[PDB]
Amino acid sequence: MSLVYMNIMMAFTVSLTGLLMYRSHLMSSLLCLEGMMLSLFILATLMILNSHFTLASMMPIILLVFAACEAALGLSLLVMVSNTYGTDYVQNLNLLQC
Amino acid sequence: MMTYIVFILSIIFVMGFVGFSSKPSPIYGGLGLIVSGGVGCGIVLNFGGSFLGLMVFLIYLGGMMVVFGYTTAMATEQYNKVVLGTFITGLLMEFLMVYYVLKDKEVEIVFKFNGMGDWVIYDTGDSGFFSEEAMGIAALYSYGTWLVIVTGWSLLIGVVVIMEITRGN
Amino acid sequence: VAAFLKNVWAKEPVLVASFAIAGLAVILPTLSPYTKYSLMINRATPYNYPVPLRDDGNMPDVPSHPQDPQGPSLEWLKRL
Amino acid sequence: PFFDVQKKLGVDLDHWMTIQSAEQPHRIPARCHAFEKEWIECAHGIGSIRAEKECKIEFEDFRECLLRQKTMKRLNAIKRQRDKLIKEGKYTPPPHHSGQEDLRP
Amino acid sequence: IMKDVPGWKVGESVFHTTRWVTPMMGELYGLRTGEEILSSTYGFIWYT
Amino acid sequence: PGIVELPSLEDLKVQEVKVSSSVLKAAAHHYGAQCDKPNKEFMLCRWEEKDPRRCLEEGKLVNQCALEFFRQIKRHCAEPFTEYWTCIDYSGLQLFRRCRKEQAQFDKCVLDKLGWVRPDLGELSKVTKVKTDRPLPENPYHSRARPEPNPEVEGDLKPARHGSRLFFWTM
Amino acid sequence: MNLMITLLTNFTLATLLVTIAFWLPQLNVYSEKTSPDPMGSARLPFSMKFFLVAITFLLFDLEIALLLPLPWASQTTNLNTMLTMALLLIFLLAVSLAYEWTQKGLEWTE
Amino acid sequence: MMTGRQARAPLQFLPDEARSLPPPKLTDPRLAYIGFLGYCSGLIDNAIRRRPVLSAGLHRQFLYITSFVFVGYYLLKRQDYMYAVRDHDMFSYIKSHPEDFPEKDKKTYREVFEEFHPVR
Amino acid sequence: MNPIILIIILMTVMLGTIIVMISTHWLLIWIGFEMNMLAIIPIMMKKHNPRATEASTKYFLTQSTASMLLMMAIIINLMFSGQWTVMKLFNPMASMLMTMALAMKLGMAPFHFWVPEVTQGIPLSSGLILLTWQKLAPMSVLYQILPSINLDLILTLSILSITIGGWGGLNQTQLRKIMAYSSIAHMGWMTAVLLYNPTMTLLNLIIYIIMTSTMFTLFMANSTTTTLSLSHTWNKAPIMTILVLITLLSMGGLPPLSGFMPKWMIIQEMTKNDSIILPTLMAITALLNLYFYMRLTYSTALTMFPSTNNMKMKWQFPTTKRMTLLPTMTVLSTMLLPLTPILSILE
Amino acid sequence: YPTKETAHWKPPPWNDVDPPKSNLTLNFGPQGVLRLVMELSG
Ligand SMILES: CCCCCCCCCCCCCCCCCC(=O)OC[C@H](COP(=O)([O-])OC[C@H](O)COP(=O)([O-])OC[C@H](COC(=O)CCCCCCCCCCCCCCCCC)OC(=O)CCCCCCCCCCCCCCCCC)OC(=O)CCCCCCCCCCCCCCCCC
Ligand SMILES: CCCCCCCCCCCCCCCCCC(=O)OC[C@H](COP(=O)(O)OCCN)OC(=O)CCCCCCCCCCCCCCCCC
Ligand SMILES: CCCCCCCCCCCCCCCCCC(=O)OC[C@H](COP(=O)(O)OCCN)OC(=O)CCCCCCCCCCCCCCCCC
């Protein structure tokens, strides 16, 4: 297929493996998650603008809004984590091993 | 060179994601995702999606990454080998992809991809006195009734959920 | 309904103006006689091409020329 | 569970955005409207198991309209043979493929 | 051009159906110069 | 698959209407009133055949009927027309509303010397009818035969034989 | 193309001015300054209220993103449905604001 | 499996052609078993709240029996309907495809040779 | 929590699952999952302790990752099909990504790694919602995409879920982790019979929801979250020991009980398709689940562990808890096997 | 079945509520004239 789809999919997989291999922070995880959402926005947008399918032009906006609301939820979760340990470190979230 | 410009922007786009997928710090991660959003917006603008690209600016960057940098600046009190190694790893993977698809005009990582510039796939007609993208977004209120109901209900519930889980009571 | 309205207009006039403007915005298109003309102007704006019909032999109300009398007229839009 | 509430109650919640051949605003056709209309009218009612083998021609036409992979492969072959014949000096472009012919209308 | 290549059908449709297909941008402006390419493929988008 | 059949370059040669877009837009309403019939023949042919190669000769008639529109302007009213499309040509959006006295002079001169009446608001967007002699396309999509549907359900509904037949359940 | 040239020109002028501001007074050979705040060295206390006004911004900005196609949506032929859904979106934004009010969300930054 | 059969008329618990079928009697052993489940639900409801198990809430036990018989009657009707639809589709398909269901030559055991295996 | 807000949030959870069930467009499927997660987050953080916030964080990360893989599968479906119908998938890459996304939403192994954590961190009612209601929407999408599900993928996920959910609960003394590993094993049982007969998938889902709702309702009635706290039940409420006895003997698949019904029918639809090794290995692996069910019945019903003195006070207060549908669910989760041919109502 | 790895695990609390494990002090000094020491709670 088209050559720009290669780069947008590979960007999605780069941000996937960033979101699938944490270092320390939960904020860097949410950044990788929203990079995944951004790459989905770009890819759905390039398809819908390519094929001239008119009614799906409202589709990525929806894909923005919900997922941006999703990001808000995650940020609040992070803040509750940072209201317990003082950092947003993912290694402090191990109380449920037992 | 200029006929490949979206491709070139897309390369910067992939580079921008390695700017934060290696996760140097969440503030440098935020900066990398801002530059990535700008170039991906430019990619959206070059297929004719002006309104969608300005949603990437107004809502993704100027709306949401503002809140990411805001929340991050309220943490990570102000003052790597793995970061730079993973960064050059992803960069060399992407430039090997560039070199392969520019020397072969064909590549297959998971799907087959053409090596010519993406100007070839476009349409050769006009849309008259409307942008088809603008009218498909204007269709959200006439044809998109159920979508507006469920989206507005999810945003109202989102406000309620954010107020519940941050109260602590 | 009378003392309460004067009380909320004395304490919180911004909110009273808010709910009054929103209430007029809700109810007044259902009562306006010009709401129909918005519909009739938006459907009379020709974004596309009026793709003509094959004259099979019995279409008495479809014109053969734009300046023919039969067909949709917009004298209401010129006059109002 | 596919509780088909829309067909039961007669409401149209999400069928309009489902296909490209549906009713679009201002009658805008998609770039593969005819191919998708032919694939849908082929594969209608006969089930997916029959439709994967009895509508393969319409679906290959529609997929190759969408992605243009055979078209771009053919353009790759034409352009690469043209570049080889330019490099070997066996071919020259015409004046109308150089920009010196004052285009038609 | 495509005289040397074995087994090539000139003007062969990549589509199975004989219906007219709207020409792609690369089908029309493929063999032309990059100036006409850019003017046809990003002219309106880049215009001011 | 098959070879696509394109017309030769002799089939595409026609006397091109080489006027600018402001000349077209200034002369637009009288072109839509006076060159109605072969234009609508052509556009009916163009939406029914769905193939421009089947619509060439009618298009030539369009390119024949447009030029006779402009020569008949050039024989009688070249000066008010030139003054009108120059003022249309000045504007960036090519507004009609900036150019009403030149339109008035052009419409007065055309209505006197050629008897043409400008279409009223709402007329050129009417859906008209075209009497043609070409046949209706019985397969404009070049569609093949559709697959035959699955057989329906019919007849009366008898009960299940000996119940459910699930291993030992007698009902 | 004109826009990309304009953006590049503005970025180049801004970078030139920033470079002149960060490097022209460096050539002053004034003096080395020995031993170059209300809180001394305490950590930054997290304010829940700043995060609350930021997330309230984000959610109402999403509702704004839904409202942004309205000058194009007034041009439709299905105006009763369009008007109902537009008033319903602005009403749900107002219900979000009223719920943010009455559950003490707009407090000490009211 | 039969999801294309009940897709032309979706979300019908009992369609119209279900009325062509005989309904279960009120003395159905399956319906009596579901009434017994209602009685067991009533006894367990009195046992978990420390009530006299047979004595307390005869109105409540009777509503348990009534509600389970009421739900189970329609469940049994739909059950018999779906097995009748299964058999109807089977028989229509065997009638429409005779080449996939040939009539077998039933041979008597005077021609049928089975290998004998002595147990010793 | 405000009870009005609780009612609106539970209706929004139910609304998101219904929007997944009733929609024909993929964007509305994704919207239903987003609405469902966004509304179930406060149900997990109801008691406001760091275990609930950690559990909600882990749940958010896994379900967000699954939703992103779901939308990527949908976008690749629009690439290779040009349309949005919730039906079969027109690319094996999109089929693989959607099967992965739904496996992450269900907690099927090796994406099971969030289910015993989150169920431990949240209350018993929210864990009941997570293990019963939150299995409905991904199994509905797996019901509707099964002409494109790869066989070896779904069977690998199924046997790996059955084996890992079997060996999980043998080491567990916490009841919510026991129900979580039971969830992983039973979801493997549901997806194993998926491509062969999805009616038996629906039967297994309904019987599992009934039995899990019975066990969580008994856990909420007795206010026990550990095995050793559940062992105090005979001195307080002796009928509840009989109820957890018959329900845990049902959940192990022991005849003549109703929980024997699904797995038997699963075998009944897998030996038709000439798979004999796979339902045999699955049935033998279910003995692990039955072993820790027997461990719980030994601790609760069949022996009498020593209680304490303060239990004598609780003899003087009857249960004021609304044990909703507990006799109905207890009867349905045990005495339903003579009504086995009722499964044709799910066809 | 406690192994060597799962030996440092204690059982969770009975109500499943964990223990949670300072207000800002500002010096608005001389930089008429006045020094202020602020104890602020936000
Ligand atoms: C004039 C207008 C009015 C006309 C009125 C006409 C009727 C007059 C009499 C009124 C009463 C009628 C009663 C129903 C008809 C007869 C049903 C019958 O006996 O079926 C024989 C049935 C098959 O025998 P058959 O020789 O082939 O058929 C004779 C008839 O043609 C059977 O007829 P069928 O071929 O139509 O039967 C259909 C089918 C025939 O059956 C089959 O196709 C075979 C499969 C049956 C299910 C097997 C499941 C195995 C795994 C689970 C084991 C469950 C636990 C076992 C028991 C634990 C302790 C309760 O039945 C089913 O599928 C229903 C499921 C089984 C329930 C049977 C009815 C129970 C009613 C009373 C409920 C009280 C509790 C009973 C015990 C609960 C457990 C069953 O026998 C069994 O399956 C053995 C199990 C026990 C049967 C229940 C006996 C009913 C009377 C019980 C009185 C004592 C209660 C003591 C207190 C409570 C328990 C502690
Ligand atoms: C139906 C029309 C559409 C309605 C929805 C659209 C609304 C558009 C405007 C958006 C409003 C968003 C915010 C609403 C918040 C309402 C709650 C509120 O503010 O209550 C508190 C307030 C008293 O203020 P207090 O809490 O004391 O503030 C501290 C500072 N002193 O309490 C008050 O001041 C009392 C407020 C309630 C009574 C207002 C009555 C106004 C009547 C105007 C005339 C009739 C208009 C028709 C509609 C009537 C609807 C009720
Ligand atoms: C093809 C299939 C299609 C779909 C079929 C239908 C699927 C049904 C799925 C059922 C899912 C049930 C989820 C849980 C119930 C929802 C409401 C809820 O949250 O109830 C719990 C509630 C919370 O009360 P709270 O104050 O939090 O208590 C804490 C202790 N102080 O209250 C309590 O804690 C009270 C204690 C008792 C609660 C018992 C609730 C039982 C609910 C399940 C009934 C069985 C399912 C329906 C029948 C079978 C259908 C398959």
Curated annotation (Swiss-Prot), chain A:
It is a multi-pass membrane protein. Signal peptide: none annotated. One of its GO terms (molecular function) is NADH dehydrogenase (ubiquinone) activity. Core subunit of the mitochondrial membrane respiratory chain NADH dehydrogenase (Complex I) which catalyzes electron transfer from NADH through the respiratory chain, using ubiquinone as an electron acceptor. Part of the enzyme membrane arm which is embedded in the lipid bilayer and involved in proton translocation. InterPro entries: NADH_UbQ_OxRdtase_chain4L/K, NUOK/Mnh_C1-like. The gene is MT-ND4L. The keyword Methyltransferase does not apply. Core subunit of respiratory chain NADH dehydrogenase (Complex I) which is composed of 45 different subunits. It comes from the Eukaryota. Belongs to the complex I subunit 4L family. GO terms for cellular component: mitochondrial inner membrane; respiratory chain complex I. Its EC number is 7.1.1.2. It is an enzyme of class 7 (translocase). One of its GO terms (biological process) is ATP synthesis coupled electron transport. Pfam families: Oxidored_q2 (PF00420). Keywords: Electron transport, Membrane, Mitochondrion, Mitochondrion inner membrane, NAD, Respiratory chain, Translocase, Transmembrane, Transmembrane helix, Transport, Ubiquinone. It catalyses: a ubiquinone + NADH + 5 H(+)(in) = a ubiquinol + NAD(+) + 4 H(+)(out). The chain crosses the membrane at residues 1-21, 29-49, 61-81. This is NADH-ubiquinone oxidoreductase chain 4L.
Swiss-Prot record, chain B:
Its main location: mitochondrion. It comes from Ovis aries. It catalyses: a ubiquinone + NADH + 5 H(+)(in) = a ubiquinol + NAD(+) + 4 H(+)(out). The lineage of its organism: Eukaryota, Metazoa, Chordata, Craniata, Vertebrata. Keywords: Electron transport, Membrane, Mitochondrion, Mitochondrion inner membrane, NAD, Respiratory chain, Translocase, Transmembrane, Transmembrane helix, Transport, Ubiquinone. It is a multi-pass membrane protein. It comes from the Eukaryota. GO terms for biological process: mitochondrial electron transport, NADH to ubiquinone; mitochondrial respiratory chain complex I assembly. The keyword Iron does not apply. This is NADH-ubiquinone oxidoreductase chain 6. Core subunit of the mitochondrial membrane respiratory chain NADH dehydrogenase (Complex I) which catalyzes electron transfer from NADH through the respiratory chain, using ubiquinone as an electron acceptor. Essential for the catalytic activity and assembly of complex I. Its EC number is 7.1.1.2. GO terms for cellular component: mitochondrial inner membrane; respiratory chain complex I. Belongs to the complex I subunit 6 family. It is an enzyme of class 7 (translocase). The chain crosses the membrane at residues 1-21, 25-45, 47-67, 82-102, 143-163. One of its GO terms (molecular function) is NADH dehydrogenase (ubiquinone) activity. It is found in: Mitochondrion inner membrane. The keyword Transmembrane applies.
From Swiss-Prot, chain G:
It is found in: Mitochondrion inner membrane. GO terms for cellular component: mitochondrial inner membrane; respiratory chain complex I. The keyword DNA-binding does not apply. The chain crosses the membrane at residues 3-23, 50-70, 79-99. One of its GO terms (biological process) is mitochondrial electron transport, NADH to ubiquinone. GO terms for molecular function: NADH dehydrogenase (ubiquinone) activity. It comes from the Eukaryota. The keyword Translocase applies. It is an enzyme of class 7 (translocase). Keywords: Electron transport, Membrane, Mitochondrion, Mitochondrion inner membrane, NAD, Respiratory chain, Translocase, Transmembrane, Transmembrane helix, Transport, Ubiquinone. It is a multi-pass membrane protein. It catalyses: a ubiquinone + NADH + 5 H(+)(in) = a ubiquinol + NAD(+) + 4 H(+)(out). Its EC number is 7.1.1.2. Pfam families: Oxidored_q4 (PF00507). Core subunit of the mitochondrial membrane respiratory chain NADH dehydrogenase (Complex I) which catalyzes electron transfer from NADH through the respiratory chain, using ubiquinone as an electron acceptor. Essential for the catalytic activity of complex I. Belongs to the complex I subunit 3 family. Core subunit of respiratory chain NADH dehydrogenase (Complex I) which is composed of 45 different subunits. Interacts with TMEM186. Interacts with TMEM242. This is NADH-ubiquinone oxidoreductase chain 3. It comes from Ovis aries. The gene is MT-ND3.
From Swiss-Prot, chain I:
It holds the Pfam family NADH_dehy_S2_C. It catalyses: a ubiquinone + NADH + 5 H(+)(in) = a ubiquinol + NAD(+) + 4 H(+)(out). Keywords: Electron transport, Membrane, Mitochondrion, Mitochondrion inner membrane, NAD, Respiratory chain, Translocase, Transmembrane, Transmembrane helix, Transport, Ubiquinone. It is a multi-pass membrane protein. It is found in: Mitochondrion inner membrane. It is an enzyme of class 7 (translocase). The chain crosses the membrane at residues 3-23, 25-45, 67-87, 96-116, 122-142, 145-165, 178-198, 200-220, 237-257, 274-294, 325-345. GO terms for cellular component: mitochondrial inner membrane; respiratory chain complex I. Its main location: mitochondrion. GO terms for molecular function: NADH dehydrogenase (ubiquinone) activity. One of its GO terms (biological process) is mitochondrial electron transport, NADH to ubiquinone. It comes from the Eukaryota. Its EC number is 7.1.1.2. Belongs to the complex I subunit 2 family. Core subunit of respiratory chain NADH dehydrogenase (Complex I) which is composed of 45 different subunits. Interacts with TMEM242. Core subunit of the mitochondrial membrane respiratory chain NADH dehydrogenase (Complex I) which catalyzes electron transfer from NADH through the respiratory chain, using ubiquinone as an electron acceptor. Essential for the catalytic activity and assembly of complex I. This is NADH-ubiquinone oxidoreductase chain 2. It comes from Ovis aries. The gene is MT-ND2.
